[PDB]
Amino acid sequence: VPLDGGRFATSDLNDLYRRVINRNNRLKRLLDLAAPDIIVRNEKRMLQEVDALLDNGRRGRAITGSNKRPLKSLADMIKGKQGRFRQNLLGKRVDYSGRSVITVGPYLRLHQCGLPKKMALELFKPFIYGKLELRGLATTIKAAKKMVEREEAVVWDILDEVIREHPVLLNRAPTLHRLGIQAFEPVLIEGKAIQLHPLVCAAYNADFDGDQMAVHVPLTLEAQLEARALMMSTNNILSPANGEPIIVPSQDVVLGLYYMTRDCVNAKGEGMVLTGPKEAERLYRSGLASLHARVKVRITEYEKDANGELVAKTSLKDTTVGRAILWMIVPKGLPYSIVNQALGKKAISKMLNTCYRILGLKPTVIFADQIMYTGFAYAARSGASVGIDDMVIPEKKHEIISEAEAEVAEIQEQFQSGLVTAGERYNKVIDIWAAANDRVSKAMMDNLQTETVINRDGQEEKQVSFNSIYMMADSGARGSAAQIRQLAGMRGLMAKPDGSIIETPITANFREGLNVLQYFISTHGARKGLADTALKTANSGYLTRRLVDVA
Amino acid sequence: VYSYTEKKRIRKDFGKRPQVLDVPYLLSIQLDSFQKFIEQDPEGQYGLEAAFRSVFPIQSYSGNSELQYVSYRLGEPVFDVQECQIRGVTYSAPLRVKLRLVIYEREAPEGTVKDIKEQEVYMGEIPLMTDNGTFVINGTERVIVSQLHRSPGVFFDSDKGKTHSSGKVLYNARIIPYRGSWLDFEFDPKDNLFVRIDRRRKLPATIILRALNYTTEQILDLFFEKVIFEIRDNKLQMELVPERLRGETASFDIEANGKVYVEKGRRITARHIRQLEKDDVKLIEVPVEYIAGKVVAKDYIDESTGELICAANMELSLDLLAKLSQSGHKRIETLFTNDLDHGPYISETLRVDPTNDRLSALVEIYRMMRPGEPPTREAAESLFENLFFSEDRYDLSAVGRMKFNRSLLREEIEGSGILSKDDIIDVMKKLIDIRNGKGEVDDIDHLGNRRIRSVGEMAENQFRVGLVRVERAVKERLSLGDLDTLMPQDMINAKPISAAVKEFFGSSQLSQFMDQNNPLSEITHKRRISALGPGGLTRERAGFEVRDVHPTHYGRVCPIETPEGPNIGLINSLSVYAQTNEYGFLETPYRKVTDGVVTDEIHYLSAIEEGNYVIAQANSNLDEEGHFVEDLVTCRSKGESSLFSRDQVDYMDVSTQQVVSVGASLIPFLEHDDANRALMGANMQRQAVPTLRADKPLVGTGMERAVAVDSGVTAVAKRGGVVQYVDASRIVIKVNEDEMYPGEAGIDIYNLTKYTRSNQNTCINQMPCVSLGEPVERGDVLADGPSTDLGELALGQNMRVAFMPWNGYNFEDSILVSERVVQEDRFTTIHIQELACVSRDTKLGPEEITADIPNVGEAALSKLDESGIVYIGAEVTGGDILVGKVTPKGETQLTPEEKLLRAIFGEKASDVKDSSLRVPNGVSGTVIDVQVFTRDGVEKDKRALEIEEMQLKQAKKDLSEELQILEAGLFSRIRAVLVAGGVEAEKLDKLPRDRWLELGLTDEEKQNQLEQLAEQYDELKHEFEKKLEAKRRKITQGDDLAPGVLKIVKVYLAVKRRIQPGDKMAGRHGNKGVISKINPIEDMPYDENGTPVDIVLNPLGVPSRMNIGQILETHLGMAAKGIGDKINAMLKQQQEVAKLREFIQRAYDLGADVRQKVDLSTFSDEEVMRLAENLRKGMPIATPVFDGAKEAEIKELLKLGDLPTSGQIRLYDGRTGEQFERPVTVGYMYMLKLNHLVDDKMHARSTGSYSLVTQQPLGGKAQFGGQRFGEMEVWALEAYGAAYTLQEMLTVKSDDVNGRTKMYKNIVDGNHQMEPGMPESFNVLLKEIRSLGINIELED
Amino acid sequence: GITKASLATESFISAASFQETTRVLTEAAVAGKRDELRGLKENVIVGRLIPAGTGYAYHQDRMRRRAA
Ligand SMILES: [Mg+2]
């Protein structure tokens, strides 16, 4: 191929064939001349080194190019991850595609994804050409091309027509399991970023810190019918690994629901009687009564005890205002006890699973959308911040540290007098620091989870707390009881690179801050964890490749 | 006491520990290395002179012909810096070398020569280094990153693993020289000693012992201890050394002098040994069965018959004992072998030794080194005696000699660069010692065994690589032909040296594009330590152990800043105070600790001295006298950290924050975050794009000043004085009298860098900060650059944040942004792009840059002038003409029916084709600058004439102006001088400046300094003339270009990328995020005073990622803006100077026990008002990294304002207008903006181009190409029932070269049919397999 | 083991796609084998309908037409 500016690019096979034809011609000329047998034997060995053309670098060493690199023969054009098989015949590059950053956009229904107008204008170019030519708004196709180049105002309604019931495909780069590619209807966006529904970020394993996704377009009728029947988002709500749903509300919505369904022991308007959940809504938004206050309401729950026929049952349940507000979301066939609790994350996943197994699929998908909407709304209405006063340090911590220091001093004196062994003092120190860490964790949790003390019409009472970090941990909304105690209690005992455990653990928390030595000890564990999470990916991908090629 | 540049925004500080060391000049490693490399060094220690004296003189092969070295000189660069950036060539300098060719006379080898010649030889061009440690190579600015490599010297490394399932340990000593061959020894699982050279096939290590001209007897003499037997006319008795019986159980009763020492059956006790020592026991009779276990030492031949009774290394049997007994060999030599102390590894290796003499060993090593060829006597002898004894092919090193002699415990630090016999002797002895047990293994990750080599050493090595080639060429040429009387130039050659050095600087693994998008980015990319590149390892063969941190990283390498993902722990950066030793080991300071007093003298400590000492901790409280105020200190002695006493301290740490990098030291509250998020924050800090109006850090560390000044972006005054005239382009300083040299006229002129591009297309630009007539001092900032602000680094802007979930729009990590941010235009960044349009020379003819193009109307041609290049300052958009370029077209081979249409209309198609450059789609900006180059022979067009005229007039004007101001200053100084000694006060200004420089005076040095200033004036005008001629010739001369090109037009765009949903914004603690929506003002949550909050983050990101530092930063920022708001409201109505004095002093005296007494009694009602005006946007707060600002100080600072101590204030709601319960944290967080802009990511492709050999679309978005539909996507589609989607996913849409055209016709015809065909790349596979003898075919 | 039983396959394109290609091709060539394109890797490589998902009915129709 002629490069611009009088340069020439060729493959190495031209050089290899040049070599073989040259040596063959030379041998022809030698056989004309009746050369000495040493000469013709040397020439035949040179002609044998055919071997380079077929598979260079197998026998002996590989002849190299002008850049002194082993050039590529035919077997290197077939084999390898750069050969035809893995790189060009199994995975191709495709027309009608594009990519961008992703953003949240919670106003979507879950069967539709946001998409910028410019990406729609680029991907659906020939559909637009055909539609414009059919409507008689451009005489030819050339005029249609120049019309969409000028972005004249009638092209957008044509784009809206051809975008109507036309699915697209969304995909993120580590496509581990079959939920990696899903279909979506588009809704056009006056931006530049793909808006993707928040409930499926768990399935995509996508977080919005700059992750990118690629769009694909199905062209033919069979492909669009496949995208609507199989790969549509509302048809993949259960994991193929196990029957648990994959549309679990993830972190914010579950916090909102957890805050919505609890019970302060004495809030505004406790002990009144409500005549239906609509009255609970009115009593809340007018502000006359709190979101959580124990209130006797009347509700009606429908049960399908008959042969697939709902049967009404109405009574006087004893619940809170927030729960009775949430009850206007649940469809007909579910018993009331599904929303009569604190509504954590396992609880809401089980609620969705029960709705799926009792009602069907359509009410469950509508229930999922309504759940996400109300979760976001009351999470924002909570005002759940996180402040430096929301990390309570238990006041017995330094005393526990002092007593553990006394114990380690005693064991140090015992080994100084030689009464014990080195491994003995090692395990004595390691066990007393383990015991002290456990006791300080107990103290922190018992001072954090339940210290709230409020007074209903009398002396005093203790309840579970609204100390926002405790909500973010107990609700299941992305917080673990093992990632607290690194904010209040001691940070445990870190490990040296050998795999042993340091004798003196880091006894400082992120509220009080570490000093230089403790931080430098803590650095190694983070670096080792980062390296392992970097190098586990290759082994996992290799294992998946082996398994999908054996089955 | 602060300078005038510091009395503007004097930053409030919180550091408790009084630092005692200034932060060193942050680039001194890079600058000092290249300063060593090129410098007139009048001895051959380091530098070019070292390479020359290590490779010159050259002697022909006894041809009496000598080429010898004299000196060298570095020339003036032809093109300076900005010219090299504009044009595109390396900022180099010629290397003129004086060489001498001399030929000796006949039978006078040491006699005098008969002829000399001295010719100044040009040998290539070396690139030079700008004054910020950056090289200019091909128009760009490249940095060479220092390498971390395994040290030259011995290594007694073990194996230490299982590695055989034998459960044994293998001690494999290894020698690495700086230039030469490796020499490895290792034991085998059968504990025999081996050897290998350069990782070849194994050999038993006796071969080199013999090859060192040693026979068996001296080998066993050196490597074992003799045991001597004395035939006392009977019984074969043996003498004794009492130590030899330790840890043994003798089979008999050890008895002598009629005294029982050891019983039979009893072991020889320690007190048995003591009794033997005290009782002076020398010789005993032993049972004859003891000797039968021995191995004989030497050769005891038959003295009578001249025959062998026993050679060396023979186990003995009792009949042979009688045979040596009857031969009268009374003294018998044996060995003291053992199971514990003296292992018989050399003895057993000699048993498996297949050699007998030196020649057998040399033949064996000749075979092992090179297979196939027959052995030869002289070839093998020369090979072995040349391999490890030549100055040529084996340079150990100077540092190699030092470390080798240290690790061998030999005293002398300096010796030969080649290996002698004793060195291998002691290496063998110490390896045997380690296998026995006395001795310790070494390790690789310890930083006492890894050096740091920088651009000086690598450039020196590449230069030596060039020189050996040119020396071999000379030795070829000097041998042949003639004597001659030839001139010492034609045997030398420039290209085989300049080629080597240019291939180093041009494309190594280390010379890369400098990320130039932040002063911090440049600083942390010049101090980078890489373990990759030549002489090191690769990421595909790097074990986890070298990736890990090590206890010897404390203050030599930052442990928390490292690129994550593909290569962690290989690109570790460098600490703040971490210097570099003389040899190249890393070094760090410590304060000297006396008996109990901390002395503020500084001692630098290397990597191996830091173990034997005891090092205190920088967080140790001391009370005014250097005594530790406690009775204990948390020291660190050898890896561990043990609570030592007050007396056993030898060294104290220097400053609290010497454990981190520079990039990670700009994170406030670093001591609170988890190290993962600290890593991500310190890695995202070096990606912030400089915004339009860089604001401040509201909560900064306190070390932004040093980073801003030490990076090269700001312009720092070199001599203090008055500022005389300030443009937006230049700054003129009149210098003070005392700082003025007696010679010249002193004014300074700085020329700022207005709106040029950078390697990442961001707009590096400077603006002045001082005003007219305002004093400056030596070292102040005069011009902030990108991301600087009054000499402080400001990488972003600080905005009001509130942590609350808000209607899903900040779900996972998204960052809701108010419209006030974009309305105030405060995250807007400016980009600058470069567009090139060549004009090549086709075979059909040359293309033109004419304005006339076919098929385009006047809408495109409205913005081109008559020559055809776009105007300066034309608001172009996407897809518009810039450089009208047409190309000739041959025939086009016209076709059916459009032939008939041409017959209908007659509008003939032109023979030219439109191929003009147009603006890439999606961008829009103003054209700021047009550059035109041309080949020398081509006649230039009109626009090139306009540009050359404008450039010439600009250059003449600027040079004339510079001469004008310089002479203005010179004559003002003359006017000041002439007052003294014969004052012409009114007389002087009567006459003009014609003869002021010649007037008489009192005959002092100023009388013969008026003439000095006059000669300065004459030299100034002559220099002006010659420089003007040079500059005019440089402008008007043609520019050399690529072959077969005519002219290049470079057009510069300036986009103004605003902000949009999709951009990535990060905090400082590594909380990234992508903006999801831009709400209006009214919808944002507003607090009780009406002020809308500005960014609504997500709270759930804190307690799982644990970066609790950002919350304390938010609180402290709220306190800072509170004090700024209070002082702004105080300044709103004009109150009083002393009221502001009172409040500012009270704000500067929080809290308890800080440094920085900053009292305002010495400020004089102008600085106070200027300080108050510069403070009104918020009082900046400092926080040194690990010294920190404790929580109670934040509480009382908030209480100084009226803000609540809890840090949380109730926010109302924007839309409903009701109240959020549970009041929410608000405050001022410093927020960045990374350059992962969305519009640089988003792209699509309907039907673009296609690849040539395999009909597939192209790569990513540069050539408008589609996405990679990976193998895993195919698995996913197979998992569903989707079949047709896969079929069109890999046949119609990609490769079926008829199917896609049929698909396009079907789609635009409104009928979504498909027609499969067969994939093209499969057919290519069919041809590739069928190219062999593999007949593969389809059949039915 | 899976990496061993993933190579004793009757199809040879399904073997040559995932392993060292040289040995597979040479053994197939001396064998003179005849792949029938039954699995999924083969029909992906030649780019016709997968005999698993939606294309199962089409492939059943083709087999019904074949040899009948
Ligand atoms: Mg992510």
Side-chain angles (χ1 to χ4, degrees), chain B residues 1271 1274 1278 1280-1284 1286-1287 1290-1291 1317-1319 1322 1325 1329 1334 1338-1340, chain C residues 12-13 25-26 29 34 40-41 43-50 52-56 58:
Chain B
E1271 185 179 3
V1274 178
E1278 287 165 310
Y1280 297 117
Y1284 289 111
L1286 194 107
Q1287 175 171 14
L1290 39 71
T1291 294
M1318 186 184 67
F1322 165 69
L1325 175 74
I1329 307 174
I1334 308 296
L1338 309 107
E1339 75 102 347
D1340 38 352
Chain C
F12 80 100
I13 306 179
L25 280 179
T26 44
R34 181 184 192 273
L40 272 60
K41 292 282 281 295
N43 292 141
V44 164
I45 284 294
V46 200
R48 55 168 61 173
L49 273 178
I50 294 180
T54 321
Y56 186 77
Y58 161 80

Side-chain angles (χ1 to χ4, degrees), chain B residues 753-813:
Chain B
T753 317
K754 308 302 289 187
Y755 295 96
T756 185
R757 74 184 301 261
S758 52
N759 301 23
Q760 274 66 25
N761 300 330
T762 64
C763 189
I764 152 191
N765 175 79
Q766 290 156 331
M767 71 198 82
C769 86
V770 311
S771 65
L772 193 142
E774 163 192 4
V776 307
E777 221 58 42
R778 180 182 177 276
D780 328 342
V781 281
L782 299 187
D784 300 291
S787 286
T788 47
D789 164 76
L790 284 94
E792 297 168 21
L793 181 61
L795 303 99
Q797 293 200 32
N798 52 329
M799 32 201 49
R800 201 180 175 95
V801 189
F803 285 83
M804 52 164 309
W806 201 88
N807 258 253
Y809 279 102
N810 50 346
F811 173 74
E812 187 94 335
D813 257 353

